[PDB]
Enzyme design. Sequence first.
Site, short mmCIF file in Angstrom:
data_model
loop_
_atom_site.label_atom_id
_atom_site.label_comp_id
_atom_site.label_asym_id
_atom_site.label_seq_id
_atom_site.Cartn_x
_atom_site.Cartn_y
_atom_site.Cartn_z
N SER A 28 0.56 -1.20 0.12
CA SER A 28 -0.13 0.07 0.10
C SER A 28 0.81 1.39 -0.03
O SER A 28 0.22 2.10 -0.33
CB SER A 28 -0.91 0.07 1.10
N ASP A 131 -5.95 -3.06 12.40
CA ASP A 131 -4.51 -3.66 12.75
C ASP A 131 -4.00 -3.24 13.90
O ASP A 131 -2.94 -2.99 14.09
CB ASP A 131 -3.74 -3.10 11.34
#
EC number: 2.7.11.1
Length: 278
Positions: A28, A131
């Site tokens: 990402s 996360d």
Amino acid sequence: LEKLRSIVSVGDPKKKYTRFEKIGQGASGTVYTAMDVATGQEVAIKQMNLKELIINEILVMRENKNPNIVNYLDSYLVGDELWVVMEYLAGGSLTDVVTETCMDEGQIAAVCRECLQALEFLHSNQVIHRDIKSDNILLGMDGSVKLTDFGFCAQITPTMVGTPYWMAPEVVTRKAYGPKVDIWSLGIMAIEMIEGEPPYLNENPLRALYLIATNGTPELQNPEKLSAIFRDFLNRCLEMDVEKRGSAKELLQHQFLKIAKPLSSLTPLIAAAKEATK
Ligand SMILES: CCN1c2ccc(F)cc2N=C(N2CCN(C)CC2)c2cc(Cl)ccc21
């Protein structure tokens, strides 16, 4: 494209920041630590290769600030790359602390309260982190706590995302993302603070997914060593039933957090865990 250029900050970040040090990289984007040339403050910088969803993600963090997250400071567009500048704490991570030192319940309660305040803030803005883990908890020398997302998982509520050992069973089995997955992950991070590691860390990460999906609520190695109040807090974070699992707002009311020691109590742990650059 014109709206994105209107929202981003004016200037060249290659001149406004210096002493770039890569601290993370994934599919990402890339994460750096850097020095703000004008203020002399150390910052964190995310570089992402790129649109209306990007506009909303930028606007929500520019307009909303909280002491328990690394806040948005600026953003720049350099060609096809978007750079997002944010706060940084250089004391260390909670990972360093749990792997090198032993925390008492009062210190765990202090960290849990700070993380839950960050979660309550994000969830109230329709943002799910996805996360939560000790690696994403930055610490200042004074014991201040800030949540980060250096794995690029967080998003405004609209694939399997996260770090396997911290994932909720409903994420593993049916990708049922919602605010309660962050609460589960916080419960796994509380187990890191007790035992030094999340459950199944000796196994490979894919095998950990099958153990989470089958075992459900993980068990502690020595639960008898914990107070009944801490055990109750852990049970509420790690409930299989999403409805029974506490929300961040509800857990901020838990009796366990009432034994929280001041954040200054973390300073000796942070100093001991810190490995000096040679
Ligand atoms: C840098 C700031 N930041 C953030 C910090 C810390 C953190 F752990 C997650 C964050 N993510 C946020 N959003 C929005 C941006 N998109 C790209 C990811 C999800 C965010 C949300 C809000 Cl209300 C405020 C700050 C945020």
